[PDB]
Every structure is written in structure tokens, then in C-alpha cells.
Symmetry: D3
Subunit: 266 residues, 6 copies
């Protein structure tokens, strides 16, 4: 695993965005061979979407031949609702880049047949072959996507019941009223994420310090699903300063020596 120890959220966003751009450009995507990008929502990836849009407007990246897939979506939330993940992605990213509408893949949280919806989402990923880079965040309790505590480490896309802790945390986007936060969500599984060629997790805030510790210095377990990255051949965690407070001095020392040149470029 690689851990990029940065200082602020702005730096984190620039590093991640630059990493996404370089992967795409080195890939040289065509209509017959597109780049598949997995994406998350929430407050964590904000600086990354900002930096991505900038680089596109500057002519550094084209999403013309990039296919996207989002991690999850709320069940029973009107698609028009500003806090649905469909609205988040368009407002913060899709509306600003040259990506074709046919290249966008989102889960339908209002699907009449939930099992069928989830299964087809997996079929769609399979038809492309693989997700080259899946970007995500991590929950306070350590969930990756909405794979809450006690989720199988070999799980696929399915419906999941949100933890009370997760709903309280997300209520910040629903006027701070947990009663307005959906109780269920459709989410890619841990196995689905482990199938991606590369996984990049953004970690911001002291609120995520325990989750980072579990991911980096803890054991593999289904209570902190973020620990599944210990089993991935190509995982990267991009962190700000507060989020690294629970790690041992020797651990942080190592990653700082390793990424010194990779980050110190002003």
C-alpha cells in the first residue's frame, strides 16, 4: 500500500486529480478502449473534483473516452433531490466536463426491482472488463462505499442498511436532521472494489484518524471494511495532516521517506 502524507485538503485534491489525469493520458483511451473510472460523493472528494475540472478547462484532460461508475446511491430518494448522488455528480463534475452522457453509469435507488438493478450494474462493469481506477473516501466507522461494519469482504453490489452513525454523519447535508437521511443505499461491494485495477482513498480530517489507523496498522476484518485494501495489489491512500494523528511515528516516518520526491514539488 502507498500512503501519501500531505498537509491540507487542497493538496490532497491536487495530488489525486493529477494522479487521475496522468493515468488516463498514459492509458490513451479510445472509443474501442475507454478508461473506466469509479467515483465517490460526499465532502471528501470536493477539492479533487475542483482540481479535475480546472485541469480539463486548461486543456490537460479530456473525458471524451472515459466511462464512469459511481460507488453508491440512496434508496427511495427522488433523483431530482439536490442531495441525491445523481444531483451531486452532475452539479460537481459531469456538468463541467466533455464526458458523453452514455459514458455515465449511476445506480438507480428508486428501481422497482432492487436485486435486478444491482445485478445489472455488475453486468455493465463486466461488459467493459474492469475499472482501471476506483476513487473513494472512508467513513468514520471505516466503511468503504456503504459497506458498513459486518459486511462481507467478498460482497458484490447490493442494498445495505445504513448504520445510525453513518446517518448522523451524513445528516450534515440534510439540514442536520437525521430523520431526513435515507435508511438504505445501493452500494458496490468490497469484492467489486477489490476487482478494480487500482484503488485510491482520500482521507481528510481528525474525524477519520481511527479509520486510517485501522486501515494501515490494523488487521483485516469486516468491522472496518477499509482494511480490505491490505489485500489489494495496488492501493493508495492520500491523507491530510490531522487524519494521520493515530499512526505510530515509525509508520508515518516510513511513508514520508518514501514519498518525499513524489509530493514535494510545490
Amino acid at each position: 500500500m502507498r500512503l501519501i502524507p500531505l498537509t491540507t485538503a487542497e493538496q490532497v485534491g491536487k495530488w489525486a486529480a493529477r494522479h487521475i489525469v496522468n493515468r488516463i493520458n498514459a492509458f490513451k483511451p479510445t472509443a474501442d478502449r475507454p478508461f473506466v473510472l469509479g467515483l465517490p460523493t460526499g465532502g471528501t472528494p470536493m477539492t479533487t473534483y475542483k482540481a479535475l475540472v480546472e485541469m480539463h478547462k486548461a486543456g490537460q484532460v479530456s473525458f471524451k473516452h472515459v466511462v464512469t461508475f459511481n460507488m453508491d446511491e440512496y434508496v427511495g430518494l427522488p433523483k431530482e433531490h439536490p442531495e441525491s448522488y445523481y444531483s451531486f455528480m452532475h452539479r460537481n463534475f459531469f456538468d463541467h466536463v466533455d464526458i458523453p452522457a452514455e459514458n455515465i453509469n449511476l445506480l438507480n435507488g428508486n428501481a422497482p426491482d432492487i436485486d435486478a438493478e444491482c445485478r445489472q450494474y455488475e453486468e455493465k462493469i463486466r461488459s467493459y472488463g474492469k475499472i482501471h481506477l476506483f476513487m473513494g473516501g472512508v467513513g468514520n466507522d471505516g466503511h468503504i462505499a456503504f459497506n458498513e461494519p459486518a459486511s462481507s469482504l467478498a460482497s458484490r453490489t447490493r442494498i445495505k442498511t445504513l448504520t445510525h452513525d453513518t446517518r448522523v454523519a451524513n445528516s450534515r447535508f440534510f439540514d442536520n436532521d437525521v430523520n431526513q437521511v435515507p435508511k438504505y443505499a445501493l452500494t458496490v461491494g468490497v469484492g467489486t472494489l477489490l476487482d478494480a485495477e487500482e484503488v485510491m482513498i482520500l482521507v481528510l480530517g481528525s474525524q477519520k484518524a481511527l479509520a486510517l489507523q485501522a486501515a494501515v496498522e490494523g488487521c483485516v476484518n469486516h468491522m472496518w471494511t477499509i482494511s480490505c485494501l491490505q489485500l489489494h495489489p495496488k492501493a493508495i491512500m492520500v491523507c491530510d495532516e490531522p487524519s494521520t494523528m493515530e499512526l505510530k511515528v515509525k509508520t508515518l516516518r516510513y511513508f514520508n521517506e518514501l514519498e518525499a520526491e513524489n509530493i514535494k514539488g510545490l
Copy 2:
């Protein structure tokens, strides 16, 4: 993972039996496409076998096209001995249902060539394709089948030396004399069990509280092989009240909210 928090062993038995019946009936097994059921012995599954026999006699289930495989068997124990697993299964289940003798698969603990016996048992499972549902219990030390502490998590059917703790616990069936309890047993491996489509573990008693905690809130490790279920895509644990005493309040709270409708049906 799913955890069904019930109160008594009777409820546990009814829930498991009902789950086995619904899986079979939804499967609609034929002679050219049988349902493969993996089964355990011991005191834990007693209420489940009782409920299964009842439902069969009531005309709710037919085992005519069900093929079974047991988890393990004692080495060097005469097949006629009442405490052999061969005798247990016939006395408590086979003698009461319409399952054809050719559909029953048990390990021969008195086989002259142990390696060959174990290998062929794996070949037999493979010829059917897969075990649709494997039901089991858990040991005081956390073993699944007889995969004692320090057993590989990728192990196959083989012979294993029983732990002194396991023999003391099983001596309750041998007049409480550990010297009469066999020292070795043939057992399916952790990998064998992980290959099953669905795994259902029955947990009863405060004596199993530590094992349940290790399985649900602990990390993946070979000392408590029951933790392998964290790596299975479809695992279910059916528990009575005493066995959940070592879990955190928040953990039990979650499963109670999740299975409320799934269990509260009187």
C-alpha cells in the same frame, strides 16, 4: 454477514429449518439437478433436525432430490458405535426422511488410506458442482468443523488432531471420559466450506459467546477459524440470547434492527 438474534434454541432450530426448506423449494431440485446440503453433528443442530423432520412429515419438504455431505467424522471409531457421526445422522435425521441412500455422503473414519478417502470426498463434491448450503456449528475455541486453532484458511478435507479442549467438550457424549473420545477426525477444510454457496452457523449457549465475538467483531485469523466467514459472500449466524453476551451493544442493536421483520413472526 447476517446475524439472526433469537432468544432460545427452539427458535434457532425453527428459523434454520425454515431457511433450509425455503432454499430447497425455491431451488426446485430434480434428479438431474439436486440440491446439495452440507450437514453437522453435535448438540447444537438438534432442534433444527427436529424441526426439519416435522416439516417433512407435515408434507412441507421432500429430500427425494437432496444430496447431503457431512462435515467430519471420528477416525478409528467403529461405524456401529452410537456416538460415531454415521450413527448420529441416521438416528437423528436419515431414518426419518425420504432421502435415497445413494444421496447420502459421509466420510469413512476407518478408511485404510486416509489421504485417498479425503481426496475422493472432495472429488465427489466436485462432481455435483457445489454445496448450495452448508450448515454448521462452532466450537468453544472457535473451530468450524474440526479445523482447530492454527488450521490453514485455505485447507481442504484432511485428517486433523483434536485439541485437548475439543476432546474434553465432546466427552459429554462419551460418559464424560475424555479417554474414550477419539484423538483424530477427518474434516472438510476451511477452503472447502468457503466454496459452499451459502454457510449457516448455529450458535447456542454462553459457552460460545467468545467464539461469536471472534467471528463477528474480531479479525480474520487461523486461531479462530470461524472468522473465515468474514471472507464468505453469503454467511449467516443464527444465535440464541446467551451467546451474544460478549458483543458490543451497538453491534447487537444493528442486527436487531435489520432482522426485526425477518424474525418477529411469532
Copy 3:
């Protein structure tokens, strides 16, 4: 997992050497079907190489049809340097046995294209099919090969930055001057090792007691990569007395009962 509890390094060396010989002879290697042996360097395997050479000179083993692959090598260290792993292997083993030079496979730590070197080493292993037995040691921090703390459990051959702790420990071979110890090394990955048919780890000294405990009684995690053996179907650890001091009495008791006949042969 099997743990062989011996008393001294001499015994450990004899047990491992005898195990390698019996595997080869039972395999009956031909030019069209060679035995693939993975090998380590360092102080740990010294008594094993000594015993192996003896048995060969005594006419008990022929390495004529044995192909070897080493675990790692220092980056930027002249191949002629006495402490390079190339020199170690020839001085301590290759120069004494009847193994053909075309059957020896070592990583080139001075390769101009590191990625290409590592990739080709994996291609070479694949062309043979599999490593039948991979022998290794364990680091003070628990690394297997040079898969230092925080290395993916699904990693392949690649370059790795040595931990300060690892360099201080290895400086004993560089006049006790850490500044002379290389900072990088090419190493087979954890996944590479898990692909071997059988893995045998030699554990010597109280200095390795914590690593043995993590491997045997700890959880699967990427901080102590030696814990990956809990996921291997055929792993063996051969230990001397001091290295077992951190295990529980019951754990050591078990392995002693299990291997009594397998070791007590004077």
C-alpha cells in the same frame, strides 16, 4: 499450518534439509519435469545449506534437475560484492552442488529497467509452472522476503524500500555500518510466495519471538506480512527454542504433541 518445535539451529537445519531432500526424491525430477526450489539468504538458512551440501556429497541428493529462484537481491550493489545475494548463494551453495548454471535464477539488482527485470522474473517462474517448495526466513519486524510492513498481501515481484530497522539488522554483514547497507531491494511479492505449492519458514533466535507470535497467534495483516501464511494451504515453520518464548503454553503444547514422532528421531 505446521510448526516444528526443535531446540537448536543445528537441528532446524537438519530437519529442513531432510525435508527438502525427501520432497525432491519423492518428486523424481526429470529434464522435462524439474523440481522448482525457492531460496533465501541471510544467517538463518546457514545450517540448512550446510546440511544440504553434506547430503549431496554423501550421495543422498542430486540437484541436476532442480531449478532454483531466489527471494530477493540488493539494488545497486555490485554483483561481485561478497555481501550481494549472488555471491552468498554461490559461496554457500551453488559452488558445492551439481546444479547446472542454466537452472539458477537470481534477480539482477543492477538492471537498467527495474520494472522489466521484475516482470521477467515472474514470467520465468510462470514458464516452469510453479515453485514446489519456497524456503525462507522471517525478519525482526515480520517481513517475508523484503515485503516490509505495509506491503500488499497480493503483491508481485517489485522494488521495495528497506525499513531502517531492516538495514540496522543487516548491517551486521556490512561491518556494522548501516550506511553501507543498500536502501532498496528487488523482492518476490506476498502473492508470489502464496502461489508456491509449499512454503517453509526457518525461525531462529529470541530476536524473532515477536514475529513468530504474530505469524502463529496473530491476525492476518500487512504490518507483519509473515501472517500471510495463515492463508496458505501448506505452510511449515521450523523453530528453535528461543524463538517460541512469546507463544502461549497451550499453543506450543499442541505442536509438540503433533510433531513428537516427526522430530524425535535423534
Copy 4:
């Protein structure tokens, strides 16, 4: 210790207030023999101060012969600053009850000789003899009073440097401006607290769940000073529901049966 498992913060304040009143009335204080009360600031005791005020107004208690000592006080913060603890106490408590000014003992956070201040405070307590009841809260990191992690468990009143986390937590009262929260504070020590006849800690909110777990199920250590209560002969913890989420099921069960009739008062 005693753990009072209540559901709401309203019930908590009412239970705690009734307890204080019962101790005072039973003690029957006089001018020559006053009841000595230790008090905290912050949001946690808000419902307790309100209830206490209601009870005094209804004529149930009189503070005419009660002497109070506060836990701490910010250093360098102007006395009449609304967030000073001197201001907090008068505004929320002293302003509404019949307590004489001479019976009020607060630490002078702006004294010339900070060391003389602390020494005199301990002297004041000794002149009265003993604090009969010390009420307090617990911080997210487990600090009791301002005895931050790594504080001696035998400490006395002294100056203390606040942890960054405590300042973020307390920024709520400084317009979420961490820069506005005082960096130092005078505080009674753990030993000062252990000298009290009885200690009652109020625990409210999910953010205190880990601190509650450390205090009840953890070991005594100076990183979570709240753990010092395990050494006190008469400690009580009054909790609301969300704060008990990290405890084991059996732990909460035990306390629920113990205090059943003790909390049915509504």
C-alpha cells in the same frame, strides 16, 4: 462503581440533581459544618444545573451552607468574558440560588503567581476537610477535569496545557474558532479528585462512547484519566443511551438489573 443507564440527557440531569439534593439534606449542613460540593462547567451538566435550580425554587434545597469548588478555569481569559468558567457558573447556577459569595471557590485563571494560586486552592479544600461530592464530565479523549492524557494519576492542582482535540471540542463556545480557545488552564488533579468522598460523572452523547468504554471496561492508565475511577471507593457514572453504545451487552445488562428500581422514578 455504579453505572446509571438512562435514556435521555433530561433524565440524567434529573437523576443527578436528585442525588445531590438527597446527599445535602441527609448531611444537614450548618455554618460550622458545611457540605462541600465540587462542580464542573461545559455543556454536559446543563440539565443538572437547571433541575437543581427548579428544586431550590420549589423549596427542596438550600445552598446557604454549601461550599463549592470548581474543577478548573481557563488561563489568560478575562474574568467577565462570557466563556470564562467564572461567568458560566454564575450565569447558569450561582445567579439563581441562595449561595453566599464567601462559600464560592473558583480558580483565578489570571493570578500573578499561578503556582501560588494552585497551592492555596488545595489548602482551601483541606481547611474544610474533604469534598463530599465531586460532580464532573468526561472529555472525548477521556480526560476528567483538564487532566489531559499522560497526566499523573496522583496529580494535584496545577497549570495544564490543553490538547489540540480539547480545544477543537471547546471551540463550539468560541464561534468554532479554535484560535480563540485558551491554550492553558488551572485544574484540580486526579489525586485531588480521588480524595473526594464521592464522585459522580455525567456521560452524554455518542462522542463519549469510547471514553465510557475506557472508564468501565478498560484498564487503569494515564492516557484516559477517567479510568482513575476504578480506584475510587465511591464512584458513579450517570449516562444517556448513545454514550453506552461501545460497551459489551453483558456489561450493560448487569447495570440495568442493578439499577432497575433505582431509575423507575421516570
Copy 5:
């Protein structure tokens, strides 16, 4: 502390009995200066009481000037009920030795003022000055006397509510009818025990292995009150083989060399 690693419960009783006799004879008690002995009930001290009786019969010890204090007593259980601790002590010990009735101090589990009883017990001990040797056992959950988990480590004699586990454990003596086991009991406190000059705890059976581990290798905490011995200047633990199964190899090794010549007496 001292840990006496013995093999059998027979050796345990003999070692403990010899120790008590040696302390008494060396002390040379008289009417004005008696030796004060603290005693337990239950199955653990059975072999010790027998040996002590044999020694008194052989003329090796006299209890004419020994004063005893028992640890606890069930509340509400009739005095002449065979399972009352008053009955247990006379039947198994007092009936066979020369101890005067006035030298016997037992707690009155059926006293009118339970609080007055406890206070007088502590007073009795103080009138003699100090208990020279307090012998006891340890429960499965680590309780010393009836100071159940979460009991203050500075507690005094008082009334205590038994844990559900302790009642299941003690049901053995109530025809395995948990409903028959008393729910309350008067018990000396941890502080009362720490005031004794010397403490000797008997540990027998595999069921006490975790309690032994907590006492020897764990941290001091109130969940396993037996851990309070780490704070005592003169504590001894006498164990049989199965009770030492959870300790580390080096821990048992250390105690074995220390007490080698100290246990060779057979």
C-alpha cells in the same frame, strides 16, 4: 508476585496447607496475640482443608489461638442450609479442628441491618489489627471473593449482587438449578483484601485459565478484580497444570525455575 506451578489439585492443597502451617508455627500465636486467617469456600480449597485437617490430626498444627474471617456469605439463605457458607465451613473444616467458637468470624447473611453487619465485620478485623494471611480462590470471570467485575479496587465489606455467570457456576451445588442460587451476598472488598499481610490464591482447572492470564499478564482493571494482586506487596498464586494454559511460554518458564527447589517436596 509468586506463582507456584504445580501439576495436580492434590499437590496444590498440600503446598497451600504446608504454607499456612509454616506461617502459623513461625508466628507462634497466643491468647493475646492470635494469628488471623482469612478463608474461602467453594470447591477450590477442598484439598487444602483436607490436608490442613490431616496435619492438625498428626499434631503438626493447633488452631487454639487462630482467629478466622471468611470472605463472604449468601444473603437470605438459611444458616443451616447445607450450601450456606456457615455450613460449608463447619462441615469441611471447623468440625475437625480445635478452633474455639469465639475465634470464628463469619458474615451474617440474614442480619436485620445488612449495613450494620458489614461495618462491624471491618471493625472486628481492625480490633485484631491485621489479617496475616488471606486465602482465596478466583472465579471464571476473575472475581476475588464476590467482588464481581466493575467492583471498586478500594472497596470495603458490603452487599453485592451476583453476576449471572457466577450463579450458573455455583448452581453445581444447587442441583444445577440457577434459580436456587442466592442472588445477593455479603463480601469483603478488594481493599479489605489488599490490607492483609499476605494473600494466597488457589487456581485450579482449565476454566480459570483466562482469569489466571488476566491476573498475571493483564493490566490492573476492575473488570477482573483478581488483577488487584499486582498492587499487593506479598501475593502468591498456587496453580495446577490446566490453569496455566493461557500464559506465555516465557512466563511459565520463569516461575518454574524460581520455584524449582521450592516444589520438589513432592
Copy 6:
């Protein structure tokens, strides 16, 4: 406690030496009221003794009215043996300062009545009243003085059997011949150490990283006696960089800001 995070062993000795001198000069000792200093042996305090000697030579301190007490002394080792602690102290300290022979208190490792020796040592300390400052080191297994793991936390001066690990560690001074290192030693106890007014522990080297972690972030327990400092009102730990490698980032951060201006002296 206070933790002084320094980089080098040279800075450590200088900081510690300056601290001792400041305490002595401020105390202003006289014949009737001497300053009582507790001292250790070994390699850790070497730089401190050198600096102290330089300071005395420069006229900054005088030991004419300082009384010293050493922690321990090997049993059975001849007094004039260069490795005896009596020899170590004179060679490295007493030989170069103006301390009177009568002010020197060392334990007699070769006394006829070893028990009388220990009792008199404690008596000596009491005759002076109290040790004002006790300086010491910490062993790899966390022992303070020679209070090996499982030593009572309330222990007094007595004879102690050395752990095998301590003898391997101390063999450095006996030509790496473990057989030459004394197996027993007279040592002050933990309680003796806790009675001191102030305790300063020097921590140097990566080999003490785990001991430092146990002392600062661990729980109080008798397996790592250095943890007893959490109970001391005035404890200080002076460390070099490598010894802080196992601490959490936030723990070291906290101490770095606290002692910033306190260590800038170079």
C-alpha cells in the same frame, strides 16, 4: 508525566545533568540537610555522568552534601570485579567528584544475611527522610531497577532473580558470555521508587521503544514495571529519537510543543 523528546544521547545526558544540578543548587544542601540522590548503572546514564563530572569540574556543582543511594547490585559478584556496580560507580562517577565516602550508599551484594542487608537499606533511606530525585534507566522488557516482569508494584528492597533476557542484555559487559552474568541481584523495589520525590528515567535506543510505549501509552501492569510511573506525582522521561518510534504521532506531537522552549538550549 513529562516526556523530554531529544534527538541524541549526548543531549539526553546534558539535559539530565543540568536538571540534577538545578535541583541540587535550588535545594542548597548542608551537613544537617543533604540532598538525597538515587542512581543507576549501565550504559544509559554514561553521558549523564560525564556531563555531571564536567559541571562539577567547572565549579557549577559540589557533592560535598549530597547523599547517594544506588538501585541495585549483583549478588555473589566480587566487589572489586570491574563489572560490579560498586566498581562501575566509582570508576564512572565517585572517583571524579568531591563526594565523601560516608555519603555513599551501595547495596552489599555479598553480605552474609542478604535479608538483613535489604532491610537496613530501606532503614537508611528513612533515616534521611526521603530521596529527592531518583534517576534510572529502563530495560528492554520494561523493568525499572531490577524489578523484573511480575514484580509487585508495591515491592520493597529485596533479592531478585534475573530474567534470562536481562542476562543476555547485560552479557555485553561480560564478554557476551551469558554464563558470566550474575543470576541474582539486590534491588530497590517499585514502592521504594514511588516513595521518591521525583523520578527521572533515561531512555536511549530503538531497543527501548516498546518499553517507552508501554510506559507512556500502555496500562499500569506488573509485567512492564516502568508503567508504575503513571502513578507517580512527579515523573520525567528523557528520550533520544530512536526510542520514540513506537509512540503515536499525536503523543509525540503533544510533548514536542510542551517542551519546545524547554529543550532549545541545544
